[PDB]
Amino acid sequence: PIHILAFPFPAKGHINPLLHLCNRLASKGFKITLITTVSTLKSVKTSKANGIDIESIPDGIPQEQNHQIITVMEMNMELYFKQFKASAIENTTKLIQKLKTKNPLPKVLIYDSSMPWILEVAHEQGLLGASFFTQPCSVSAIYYHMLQGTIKLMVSLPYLPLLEIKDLPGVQQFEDNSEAVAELLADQFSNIDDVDYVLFNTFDALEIEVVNWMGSKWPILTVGPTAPINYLFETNTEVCMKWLDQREIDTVIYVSFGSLASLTEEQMEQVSQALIRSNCYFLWVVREEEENKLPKDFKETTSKKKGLVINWCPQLDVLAHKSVACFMTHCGWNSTLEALCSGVPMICMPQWADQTTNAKLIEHVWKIGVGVNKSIVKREEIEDCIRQVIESERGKELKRNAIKWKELAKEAVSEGGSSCNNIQEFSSSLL
Numbered sequence: 090p091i092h093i094l095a096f097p098f099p100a101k102g103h104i105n106p107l108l109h110l111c112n113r114l115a116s117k118g119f120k121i122t123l124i125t126t127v128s129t130l131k132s133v134k135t136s137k138a139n140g141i142d143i144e145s146i147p148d149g150i151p152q153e154q155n156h157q158i159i160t161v162m163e164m165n166m167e168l169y170f171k172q173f174k175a176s177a178i179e180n181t182t183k184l185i186q187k188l189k190t191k192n193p194l195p196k197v198l199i200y201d202s203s204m205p206w207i208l209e210v211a212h213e214q215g216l217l218g219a220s221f222f223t224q225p226c227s228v229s230a231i232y233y234h235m236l237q238g239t240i241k242l243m244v245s246l247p248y249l250p251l252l253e254i255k256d257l258p259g260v261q262q263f264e265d266n267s268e269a270v271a272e273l274l275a276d277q278f279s280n281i282d283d284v285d286y287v288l289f290n291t292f293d294a295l296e297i298e299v300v301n302w303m304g305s306k307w308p309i310l311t312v313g314p315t316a317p318i319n320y321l322f323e324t325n326t327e328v329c330m331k332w333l334d335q336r337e338i339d340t341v342i343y344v345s346f347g348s349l350a351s352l353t354e355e356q357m358e359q360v361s362q363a364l365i366r367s368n369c370y371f372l373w374v375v376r377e378e379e380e381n382k383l384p385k386d387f388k389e390t391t392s393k394k395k396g397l398v399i400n401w402c403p404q405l406d407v408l409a410h411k412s413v414a415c416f417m418t419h420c421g422w423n424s425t426l427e428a429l430c431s432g433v434p435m436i437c438m439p440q441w442a443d444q445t446t447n448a449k450l451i452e453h454v455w456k457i458g459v460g461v462n463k464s465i466v467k468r469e470e471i472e473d474c475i476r477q478v479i480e481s482e483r484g485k486e487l488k489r490n491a492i493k494w495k496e497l498a499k500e501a502v503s504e505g506g507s508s509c510n511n512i513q514e515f516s517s518s519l520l
C-alpha cells in the first residue's frame with residue numbers, strides 16, 4: 090500500500106476531522122500512521138479497531154498538572170507556540186527517519202494547516218506535503234486577507250456577508266496572547282504556493298462563491314465533511330445512547346461547548362437554570378475538569394428528572410439520533426458542520442476565534458440557527474432561544490433548512506458528489 094503520514098495540531102477539533110479523513114483513506118487501501126504528542130496519547134483510549142499505527146512525539150512545551158497543550162500555550166503563546174514548533178520540526182524529522190527503515194516507505198505527509206512549516210520537513214524528507222484546513226473556506230479567507238494586509242484584527246470582505254465587529258474571528262478574547270494568535274492564523278497562507286495539495290473540511294454547495302474565488306488562485310480540494318472506529322477518546326457511548334433511546338422524536342436539547350472553551354461559574358449557573366425552567370429533556374456535556382463549577386447538587390439531583398450530564402459523548406451518534414431537537418453550541422467548526430450535515434438546528438453561543446464568525450454564517454447565511462445576546466448570557470435569553478427553536482414556527486423553518494443542508498451534504502460525499510470526486514482525485518494523484 091501507499092503510506093500516508095498524518096500530523097494534526099494537538100487539540101480535539103484538529104485531531105478528529107483528520108482522523109475521519111484517515112479512516113476514509115484507509116478504506117481505500119492506504120496505510121496510515123498518525124503522529125500524536127505524548128499529551129494527546131495520554132487521553133487516547135481506543136485505537137485497535139481502526140488499524141492505524143500511532144507514533145508519538147514529545148510535547149515540546151511544559152507539562153502542567155493534567156492540562157492539555159493549548160491550555161499550557163496560553164500562559165505565553167508567543168514563546169510556547171514557537172517552542173512547540175522547534176520541537177515538532179526536530180522530532181517529526183527523527184520519526185520520519187525511523188519510518189524510512191520500514192516497508193512500506195512513507196510517501197506523503199498530511200499536516201494541519203496551522204503548522205505550515207511542516208511543509209519544509211516533508212519536502213526535506215522527499216515526501217509530498219498536503220495542508221489540511223480544519224475551518225471553512227469563508228473563515229480561512231479572512232486569515233488570507235490578514236496576511237495580505239487587507240484587514241488587521243461594519244466590515245466588507247469579498248464573497249462574505251457584511252460583518253459586524255462582533256462577527257470577526259475573536260482574537261481580542263486571548264488578552265496578552267491576542268497578537269500571537271492573529272499572527273499564527275494568518276501564517277496558514279504563508280507558503281500556500283509551495284504546498285502539493287490544499288485540503289479544506291467543507292463542501293462546495295455550502296460556500297459556492299468563496300470556494301470558486303479561492304480556486305481561481307490555487308487548486309484546492311474540498312473534501313468535507315470528513316466525518317462519516319470513529320472515536321479515539323472515551324465517549325460514554327452506552328450510557329448516552331440508552332438514555333437517548335428512551336426519548337421521543339424531537340424532544341432533546343443537546344448542549345456542548347466543545348473540547349476547550351470553559352465558562353465561568355457565573356455563566357454555568359445561568360445555563361443550568363435555563364435548562365431546568367425550559368422543562369425540556371437535555372443532554373449536557375460538562376468536561377470533567379469543569380464539573381466543579383456547576384451548582385451544587387445539579388449533576389446528582391436536580392438534573393435527574395429531565396437531564397443527562399456527562400463528561401463526553403459520542404457526538405456524531407448523538408446528533409444522528411431522532412430524539413435530538415436542537416443543539417446549543419459554542420459554534421466550533423466541527424460541531425457546526427456535524428450539526429448541519431445531521432439536519433439539527435442550533436442555538437449559538439460562540440466564545441472565541443472562528444466561533445463568532447461561524448455563528449453569523451449559521452444564523453444569517455445558512456439560516457439553521459439563532460444567536461443568544463449577551464447582557465453574561467442570562468437564563469431568560471437562553472429560555473427565549475429554546476422556545477424559538479422548539480416551539481415557534483421559526484423553529485420549524487430552521488429545521489426545514491437544516492434538512493435541506495443535510496441532503497446537500499449527503500450528495501457531496503456520495504458517488505459523483507464534489508467531495509467524493511475530490512478525495513478520488515487526491516487518491517489517484519498519489520497512485
Ligand SMILES: O=c1ccn([C@@H]2O[C@H](COP(=O)(O)OP(=O)(O)O)[C@@H](O)[C@H]2O)c(=O)[nH]1
Pocket residue numbers: 100101102103105106345346347348349350374400401402403404405420421422423424425427
Ligand atoms: O461530548 C463531545 C463533544 C465534542 N466532541 C467532538 O469534539 C470536536 C469538537 O470540535 P469543535 O470544532 O466543535 O470545537 P473545539 O473543541 O475545537 O473548540 C468535534 O469533533 C466533536 O464531534 C465529541 O466527540 N464529544
